[PDB]
RNA sequence: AUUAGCAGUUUCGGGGGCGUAAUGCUCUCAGCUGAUUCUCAAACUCUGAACAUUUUUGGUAAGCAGAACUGGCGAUGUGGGUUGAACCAAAUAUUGGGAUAAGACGUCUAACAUUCACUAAUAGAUACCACAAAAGGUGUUAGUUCAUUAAGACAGCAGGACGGUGGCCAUGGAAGUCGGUAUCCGCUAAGGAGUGUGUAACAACUCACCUGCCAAAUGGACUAGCCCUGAAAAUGGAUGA
RNA sequence: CGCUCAUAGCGACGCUGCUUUUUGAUCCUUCGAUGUCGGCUCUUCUUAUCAUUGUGAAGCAGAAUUCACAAAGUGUUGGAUUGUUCACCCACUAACAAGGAACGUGAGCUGGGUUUAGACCGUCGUGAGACAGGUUAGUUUUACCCUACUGUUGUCAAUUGUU
């Protein structure tokens, strides 16, 4: 129920790779950016998980 | 630092004591003198000498007094200047001397101020407020 | 490039009628009525009876012939929620204040107080036609409903791009009103 | 090409033709939800009496077999089109096949999406459902109703067949509670004979 | 380099200029090693030659090949051993760089150091490629037609210009193709010394086979 | 000038090993010799041809300094390159007609038609000449080669993902999943002594692997065209507009 | 390297660029003369953004900080020492970012220095004298022309017949 919750908002916020040359947010499934900035390139990590 | 007044903060008293001015302490301590260095809260211009109306929290040094204070840097408070200022009343004060007191980077006045202490200050500052003779 | 596209085809249900004129269509329905332009070139879309309406695409490049499918696809969501309408469920999550949201179908809006902690009424106008009503399940959820897919989704994303804190870490909290089931449609 | 790739499916073609000739009776079986610790002991009561051959949609590359024995592939019950399917083959016990096949079975919840068994009955009532998960019931859209003093979606019957896909909510309810509807593993569609159908009547006992 | 941008001598320029009697003060290349991995093995273990040629002509610096090599050497032991490799470079800095230095870099003159007297000390080293020629050999294994490829990989990114990479078709180090090769070994006319093949003749070798034939492969 | 192993020495220079030990026997190892191997040159050669462009030395370079050949400029306009000492066409008494050269032919501006791709950028557009690179792009265009597929591929979705066994190592605990080494068999269509998430370690989840549904193409590693990223500078702004 | 983990942030050994805010290189212009340095004053422009705005990364829990994008719209200080740009400190600040304009700005100033003649010292020189060493004293001329700019009349010589 409240496990639920907090896997939706990670859906729209942290599961998504984040690029390199660029910091652009993608989706989970990406290999380019979709930014004429970063000249949508190939260097994909993903974003990382919550640490206190 | 703090400062935590009041709730604005006044409702400005005029330039009165810019940097190089000299004033009384009037407050039980060593000093006799307060040489104004700058005062805080001024974002500058290009040719203007920080100044600092009442109430004003200025980084002063004692250039007359006993030893313990002097040849170092340190936080104090303008209590009443000579320069005339409007208040909300509509009248215009001043007072008979520029002074200030010792404190504390808060705004802690851990002597007793003497001679008159101008509301805008106590308004201000309650500390001083608190150690204030005169407020009138 | 200039390859020759086939057709692409959408069926039509017997409940709806789709009109179309100067490359423009128009579904109409039990539930109501959406309208749709489409501008492209040699782009003959036509209707077959009242069983098949077809896209076509005389000599069409890569980027002319990937449109037509798209084309396709929205005339068919249409066809969708002109006869079983789209509803988006919208779950809503912070773990201390409670976000309190609050639906107004005379403005046809929502409005959330509390959120982080913001004392402002965060609210925002749904688009037309589409509307939110205030179901429980125990304080947790929106259900929005609506003919047209593409404006729904919009109201959705609206409220929840808005609802959520932008400063400091993302991660670090749930704030939000997020879009839960949005393949389920309202039941006929 | 054709005979190639990881794991050879030339290899597996030997397997369902040249051994599709080499027992007396035959039972046609459903896999789409048995697991490998459910089957395995099925591969040994079976394997004892005959063998469990099947490439899985090698019965199209069976042709060259069918020109002497005539074998029915999508003409006998079920035409295989829709469902997977596992072959038993058995010579020795032809007669205690049919009932130690169903001996093996497993009960368990329903699972998201999965084809399912012959009975599916969805958790319901106050045994069926749960004060703490009416709000599940809250979140759907299909109706809740108060029936013998608890809230539920009322429904007690069998709504799904064999290749028919259940419902995630559903799948999750059953997850949820302790209700299994059904004992399942490798269950007869029908008895198979060599060139014809023995019996073309399903047999769960 | 390290004193200066190796775009100062990308290109080949002036004619070639090499450590001798009259050029005898320069400085010891960066690159005093043309190995890597087993030297030792016989060029009969591994029959796959990756060579990396450089598409430009150029003046492909020691210090540059010195980056190369290593990189290789540190793509040896994340992928395989040290006994899958064999590497003698085929480039050495023969010519030497020239450097006119000037006094005023941080100072003052009025035009007094200058050029009166421009000629260049001898500080560095290069090797002068053309257009196909190979800057690294690999002679290897079969099983490694990717990880020595993403080796040299690697070293293209050290080097000026762009840079071609290829597989040969024979045993590397060796005239010989894999064909040719295997026909020779198999009649007995093929003899090995060590990490090199010899060969027999039969020009030479009108009737003295008694000991080219004792050693045939 | 320089790299590499190899053979025969190998007892030798030195380390040991070998029969209790030795200029006695064999290795790595140095040295000697032999046949192979890498690379090499203004001041090497067996051999050995035919301001501008080309050749060419110093210089990091220069619209720098210095040479060779040829042609220019200077001494020289004219047509063209928007503009211009040297570029291209082409040489200059005064004219007419003709037809051309370079170069152009939307408009400025004399001159156009037809025809096939490419470019989706605010790009790109007359050599010298007013710039641009290594390196990137699931942008598009074409091309190369390899593999898979009606034996059911590819994509999605669905089922399964087991026994020996928690193998053997090690230890608070490491039980497929901190880490070390082997990494085989049973039962199978098929399931790594295991790809991560996770757990004191487990469990649970996930992947390789196999198969159902659907139904004809699919996957990849390169290549080179244009295009994009790489690509920041001071008055306002330059494909000449 | 960053406990783990190449690329949060850094980044060897290498390589590829750009800028003309450094100093050289050169000698093309200027030697019948383009007033050198710094400061004050004032304007404009650049972005390679210090702050502020909106954003995105982070080894981003919070606060704080670091990294990147769109952005040059608005800001970017008072002082001690020094002729000093530069430097170094004190204090304020949201921040006290880097730069260009004939190394912006001498018929705008100042003249502190450099940079004539007087003079002193040190070292050098037999000496006259030298010093890119130190010290002290030492003329800053002219706009009324043209344009540019600031403002001011006035003609739109039909301001569309006149006012």
Not at chain 2, 55 to 80: H, I, N, S, Y
Not at chain 3, 7 to 13: E, G, T
């Amino acid at each position: 129920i409240e496990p639920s919750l907090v896997i939706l908002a990670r859906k729209y916020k942290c599961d998504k790779m984040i690029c390199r040359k660029c910091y652009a947010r993608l989706h989970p499934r990406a290999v380019n950016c979709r930014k004429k900035k970063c000249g949508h390139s190939n260097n994909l990590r993903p974003k990382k998980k919550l640490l206190k | 630092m703090s400062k935590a007044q009041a709730v604005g903060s006044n409702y400005r008293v005029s330039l009165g004591l810019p940097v190089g001015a000299v004033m009384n302490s009037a407050d039980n301590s060593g000093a006799k003198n307060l040489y104004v260095i700058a005062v805080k809260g001024i974002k500058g211009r290009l040719n203007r000498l920080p100044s600092a109306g009442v109430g004003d929290m200025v980084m002063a040094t004692v250039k007359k007094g006993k030893p313990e204070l002097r040849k170092k840097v340190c936080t104090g408070l303008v209590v009443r200047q000579r320069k005339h200022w409007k208040r909300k009343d509509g009248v215009y004060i001043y007072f008979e001397d520029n002074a200030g007191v010792m404190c504390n980077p808060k705004g802690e006045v851990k002597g007793n101020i003497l001679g008159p202490v101008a509301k805008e200050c106590s308004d201000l500052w309650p500390k001083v407020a608190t150690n204030a003779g005169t407020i009138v | 490039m200039k390859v020759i596209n086939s057709s692409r085809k959408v069926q039509i249900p017997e409940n709806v009628t789709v009109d179309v004129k100067g490359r423009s269509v128009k579904v109409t329905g039990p539930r109501g009525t959406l309208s749709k332009s489409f501008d492209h070139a040699s782009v003959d879309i036509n209707l077959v009876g009242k069983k098949e309406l077809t896209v076509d695409l005389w000599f069409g490049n890569r980027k002319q012939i990937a449109c037509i499918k798209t084309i396709t696809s929205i005339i068919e969501n249409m066809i969708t929620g002109v006869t079983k309408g789209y509803e988006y469920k919208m779950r809503f999550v912070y773990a201390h204040f409670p976000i309190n949201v609050a639906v107004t179908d005379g403005g046809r809006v929502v409005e959330i107080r509390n959120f982080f902690g913001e004392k402002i009424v965060r609210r925002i106008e749904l688009l037309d036609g589409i509307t939110c009503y205030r179901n429980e399940k125990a304080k947790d959820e929106i259900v929005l409903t609506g003919n047209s897919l593409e404006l729904l989704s919009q109201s959705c994303a609206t409220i929840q791009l808005r609802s959520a804190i932008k400063y400091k870490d993302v991660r670090k909290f749930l704030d939000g009103i997020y879009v839960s089931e949005r393949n389920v449609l309202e039941s006929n | 090409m054709s005979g190639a790739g990881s794991k050879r499916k030339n290899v597996f073609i030997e397997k369902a033709t040249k051994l599709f000739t080499t027992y007396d009776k035959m039972i046609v079986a459903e896999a789409d939800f048995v697991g490998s610790s459910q089957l395995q002991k099925i591969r040994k009561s079976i394997r004892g009496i005959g063998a469990v051959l099947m490439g899985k949609k090698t019965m199209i590359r069976k042709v060259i077999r069918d020109l002497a024995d005539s074998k029915p592939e999508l003409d006998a019950l079920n035409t295989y089109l829709k469902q997977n399917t596992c072959i038993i083959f058995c010579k020795d016990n032809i007669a205690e096949v049919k009932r130690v096949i169903n001996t093996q079975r497993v009960g368990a919840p329903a699972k998201a999406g999965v084809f399912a068994p012959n009975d599916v009955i969805i958790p319901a009532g106050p045994t069926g459902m749960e004060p703490t998960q009416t709000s599940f019931l809250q979140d759907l859209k299909i109706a809740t109703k108060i029936n013998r003093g608890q809230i539920d979606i009322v429904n007690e019957v069998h709504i799904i067949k064999t290749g028919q896909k259940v419902g995630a909510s559903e799948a999750t309810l059953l997850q949820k509670l302790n209700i299994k509807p059904f004992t399942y593993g490798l269950e007869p569609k029908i008895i198979y004979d060599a060139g014809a159908c023995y019996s073309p009547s399903i047999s769960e006992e | 380099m390290g004193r200066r941008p190796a775009r100062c001598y990308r290109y080949c320029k002036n004619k070639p200029y090499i450590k001798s009697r009259y050029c005898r003060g320069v400085p010891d290349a960066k690159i005093r090693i043309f190995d890597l991995g087993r030297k030792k093995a016989s060029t009969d273990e591994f029959p796959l030659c990756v060579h990396l040629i450089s598409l430009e002509k150029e003046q492909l610096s020691s210090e540059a090949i010195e980056a190369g090599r290593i990189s290789c050497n540190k793509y040896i032991s994340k992928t395989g051993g040290k006994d899958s490799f064999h590497m003698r470079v085929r480039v050495h800095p023969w010519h030497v760089l020239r450097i006119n230095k000037m006094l005023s870099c941080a100072g003052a003159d009025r035009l007094q150091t200058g050029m009166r007297g421009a000629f260049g000390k001898p500080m560095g080293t290069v090797a002068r490629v053309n257009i196909g020629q190979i800057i690294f050999s690999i002679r290897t294994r079969d099983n490694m037609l990717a990880n020595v490829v993403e080796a040299l990989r690697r070293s293209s990114y050290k080097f000026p210009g762009r840079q071609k990479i290829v597989v040969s078709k024979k045993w590397g180090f060796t005239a010989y193709n894999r064909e040719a090769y295997q026909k020779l070994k198999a009649d007995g006319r093929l003899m090995n010394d060590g990490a090199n093949v010899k060969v027999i003749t039969n020009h030479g070798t009108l009737a003295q086979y008694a000991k080219d034939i004792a050693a045939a492969n």
